[PDB]
Design a protein around this ligand. Structure first.
Ligand SMILES: [Zn+2]
Ligand SMILES: [Zn+2]
Ligand SMILES: [Zn+2]
Ligand SMILES: [Zn+2]
Lengths: 103, 103, 103, 103
């Protein structure tokens, strides 16, 4: 009703529709049933991306803050940030050490 | 019967009801079917939080000890600690290096 | 048929029955339908433990080698090692730095 | 239809069939219904491997780049790389520090 299921690589992440609108002009804030990767039977959106890193991607919408995970390298996370349409420059002060280590 | 399902961000964590009572005056020790985010059909509680960090949150109840995860930054974990009503000061000696690094 | 489902904290881990026999005299090598936490309907064993760390616990049986995870502290992992009846002294050379850091 | 479910240790990872063909001559690029670990009822392939590390294994196919996870040791990951038929020498520049630390 007020929730959406984003099946990312098999893992069915779930959140309120309103949460996804918190960051406008991104792939998630743009979800629509006209999308081909939307299944009307299961009522979900399938994305062939890293399911582990997605919790971190989705946490940006939930908390309004961008943190970097520390179980994967910055480059892998940033690839995910680019696919989802998020900006890495928004990274929190606490996640600078894990952000600059790469460049 | 003696277990409860806490659907945190799509991930259905499961524990015994008694485990949640181990830390009184917290959001989890307060679960009730009167709550709106409780679904009588699936018989579960939905919370729009980081599903990965929750295992760590729930492990505090299971073991009676507060450890910090090391796959996310202290600040992100602490945000979760605040939502769940847990106190970070209870952090174990072994998790001080990951606790003070931030402040 | 030749597989068993160990529902650890909500997460249904699955392995071949033979894998669990690889380390005799442990809680997992001892699984039996006489156990109360065994559900004949779903055909699974429920354990109220850390679901994330379990993959590491189960990987000891699968690979025959004991590695320590690096997304949680040694103490938390060791608590799990004790519950499951595994011996930390078997830790691999590659996981000594994460093993001795604590003591 | 255009997707496949790889049940790795209980966790049902999902991807497009085409993604698996991106790295020829590997176990995943070779999946076939003639395989005994393929279940026609559930329509999936079961592999008794580390379910956590698999997201990293599968991310190599998705992104075309090999990164090492940092929540487990290099040796454990490499064991998985060998089972899946992937080559560790392809490791990205950003994941050298976590690759050479071991040898
Ligand atoms: Zn941070
Ligand atoms: Zn600790
Ligand atoms: Zn190791
Ligand atoms: Zn990398």
């Amino acid at each position: 009703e007020n929730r959406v299921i984003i099946n990312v690589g098999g893992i069915r992440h779930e959140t309120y529709k309103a949460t996804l609108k918190k960051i406008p002009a991104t792939r998630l804030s743009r979800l629509t049933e006209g999308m081909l990767n939307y299944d009307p039977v299961l009522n979900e959106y399938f994305f062939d991306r890293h399911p582990g890193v997605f919790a971190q991607i989705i946490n940006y919408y939930r908390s309004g803050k961008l943190h970097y995970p520390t179980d994967v390298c910055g480059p892998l996370f940033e690839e995910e940030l680019e696919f989802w349409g998020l900006d890495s420059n928004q990274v929190e002060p606490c996640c600078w050490m894990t952000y600059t280590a790469h460049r």
